[PDB]
């Protein structure tokens, strides 16, 4: 056996404990041995800690990661680790103008970061954004052929294209030090400015809309997702997930599920399995969240009509849920709200409709022509011609 003695400083270097570790020791067993040694390092909970080597530079720092192993780093008998505290403020630029002062994982690259810092902002398309490392230098203390020459290069200036950080490393390795101020600021141009938000005002409007939807039935989801909707809704209206408060029996189901599954079982013990999973997230975090899972269902932005029609060889109906959206048509299993079959809207040659059944031709000569039978057979036809006739 060779012992691995190391210098273990907590909160600081204010307590430096020497201790004995197995060179093949998990980082995660040291850290748990640390907590379990030094009663100065049981404040939080492990989560928030790590052991930080610190590299030749001072302003080059290594997280050890916890399925490495001490040995890995190379630690031999003297040296010194931190268990330090990852949390650490860092002063960025909002979208508002205002430079906010906000706690990031310093083990975390920029990218997993970005994802808790604007969604903590109410910003739902959070993947759009990055950050810039931003340079004020404006406050000065105090002929014919080359400067011809001299106008024509002064007024063809460069472009000093934008300073964006890599969202593969994290603000140590890209040289980012603690109190330097970054600006928050769209990188890409994808989804339209109209359908996001940038305030908790207006993310508060989109989660107002997408759960009314949910709730009312207007959107379809499975059972499976109406918890995990119900899982972010206690989230916003409750907080953290408390085991010994929210016990079987405290909520009311009605405010929290589509109607269909408030009588279907472990429907509540789903929802506060999904509500402890957010953690300690925030309200505004939650409705982020909330939101963008609405929006990630192809069922988003899609009228239903509860149709009957046939399947394979079974003289009788199907309870069927049929789909119409600005672009496509499909169909829907009403018990699992999965997505069966679905047509662009290009391909829709020609549509009947009865006051028992509604009939589609596409450009498959297919089975038939896709035939429901429905009462609102007219409403659907209104509904699909408003989306061609004006395309």
Same mark, same amino acid.
């Given at each position: 056996?060779?012992?691995?003695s190391? *210098?273990?400083?907590?909160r600081?270097?204010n307590?430096v404990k020497?201790?004995?570790?197995?060179?093949?020791?998990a980082?995660?067993?040291?850290?748990r041995?640390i907590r379990?040694?030094?009663?100065e390092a049981?404040? $939080? =909970?492990?989560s928030d800690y790590?052991?930080?080597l +610190?590299?030749?530079?001072?302003?080059?720092?290594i997280?050890?990661?916890?399925?490495r @192993?001490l040995?890995?780093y190379?630690?031999r008998?003297?040296?010194?680790?931190?268990?330090?505290?990852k949390?650490?403020?860092?002063?960025?630029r909002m979208?508002?103008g205002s430079?906010k002062?906000?706690?990031v994982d310093?083990? *975390?690259?920029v990218?997993?970061?970005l994802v808790?810092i604007? +969604?903590?902002?109410?910003?739902?398309?959070? &993947? &759009?954004?990055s950050?810039?490392?931003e340079?004020?230098?404006?406050?000065?203390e105090?002929?014919?052929?080359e400067?011809?020459?001299?106008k024509?290069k002064?007024?063809?200036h460069?472009?000093?294209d934008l300073?964006?950080?890599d969202?593969s490393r @994290?603000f140590?390795?890209?040289?980012?030090?603690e109190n330097?101020?970054?600006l928050l600021?769209?990188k890409f141009?994808?989804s339209?400015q109209?359908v996001?938000?940038? /305030?908790p005002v207006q993310?508060n409007?989109?989660? %107002?809309?997408?759960?009314? /939807?949910?709730?009312?039935? +207007?959107?379809?989801?499975?059972?499976?997702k109406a918890?995990?909707?119900? $899982?972010?809704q206690?989230?916003i209206?409750?907080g953290p997930?408390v &085991?010994?408060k929210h016990?079987?029996?405290?909520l009311?189901?009605?405010?929290f599920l589509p109607?269909e599954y408030?009588? =279907?079982?472990?429907?509540?013990?789903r929802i506060?399995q &999904?509500?402890?999973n957010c953690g300690e997230?925030?309200?505004i975090?939650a409705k %982020?969240?909330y939101?963008?899972?609405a929006?990630?269902?192809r069922?988003?932005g899609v009228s239903f009509?509860?149709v009957?029609?046939?399947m394979k $060889?079974?003289?009788?109906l199907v309870?069927?849920?049929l789909?119409?959206?600005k672009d496509?048509?499909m169909?829907v299993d009403?018990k699992?709200?999965?997505?069966?079959?679905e047509?662009p809207? @290009?391909?829709?040659?020609?549509?009947?409709?009865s006051?028992?059944?509604?009939?589609?031709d596409?450009?498959?000569?297919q089975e038939s022509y896709?035939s429901? =039978?429905?009462?609102? $057979?007219?409403?659907?036809?209104?509904?699909?011609?408003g989306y061609?006739?004006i395309?």
């Amino acid at each position: 056996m060779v012992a691995l003695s190391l *210098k273990i400083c907590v909160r600081h270097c204010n307590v430096v404990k020497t201790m004995q570790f197995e060179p093949s020791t998990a980082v995660y067993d040291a850290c748990r041995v640390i907590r379990e040694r030094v009663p100065e390092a049981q404040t $939080g =909970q492990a989560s928030d800690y790590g052991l930080f080597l +610190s590299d030749e530079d001072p302003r080059k720092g290594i997280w050890l990661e916890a399925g490495r @192993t001490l040995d890995y780093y190379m630690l031999r008998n003297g040296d010194i680790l931190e268990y330090k505290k990852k949390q650490r403020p860092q002063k960025i630029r909002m979208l508002d103008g205002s430079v906010k002062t906000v706690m990031v994982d310093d083990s *975390k690259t920029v990218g997993e970061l970005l994802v808790t810092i604007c +969604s903590r902002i109410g910003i739902t398309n959070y &993947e &759009e954004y990055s950050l810039i490392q931003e340079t004020i230098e404006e406050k000065k203390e105090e002929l014919r052929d080359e400067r011809k020459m001299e106008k024509l290069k002064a007024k063809l200036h460069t472009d000093d294209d934008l300073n964006w950080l890599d969202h593969s490393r @994290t603000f140590r390795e890209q040289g980012v030090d603690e109190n330097e101020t970054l600006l928050l600021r769209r990188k890409f141009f994808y989804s339209d400015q109209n359908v996001d938000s940038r /305030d908790p005002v207006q993310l508060n409007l989109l989660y %107002v809309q997408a759960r009314d /939807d949910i709730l009312n039935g +207007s959107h379809p989801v499975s059972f499976e997702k109406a918890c995990e909707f119900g $899982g972010f809704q206690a989230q916003i209206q409750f907080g953290p997930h408390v &085991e010994h408060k929210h016990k079987p029996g405290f909520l009311d189901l009605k405010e929290f599920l589509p109607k269909e599954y408030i009588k =279907q079982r472990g429907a509540e013990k789903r929802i506060f399995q &999904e509500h402890k999973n957010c953690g300690e997230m925030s309200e505004i975090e939650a409705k %982020v969240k909330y939101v963008k899972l609405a929006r990630s269902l192809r069922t988003y932005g899609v009228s239903f009509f509860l149709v009957k029609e046939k399947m394979k $060889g079974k003289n009788k109906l199907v309870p069927r849920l049929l789909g119409i959206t600005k672009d496509s048509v499909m169909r829907v299993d009403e018990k699992t709200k999965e997505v069966l079959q679905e047509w662009p809207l @290009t391909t829709v040659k020609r549509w009947a409709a009865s006051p028992k059944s509604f009939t589609l031709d596409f450009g498959e000569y297919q089975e038939s022509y896709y035939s429901v =039978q429905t009462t609102e $057979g007219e409403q659907i036809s209104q509904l699909i011609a408003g989306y061609i006739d004006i395309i």
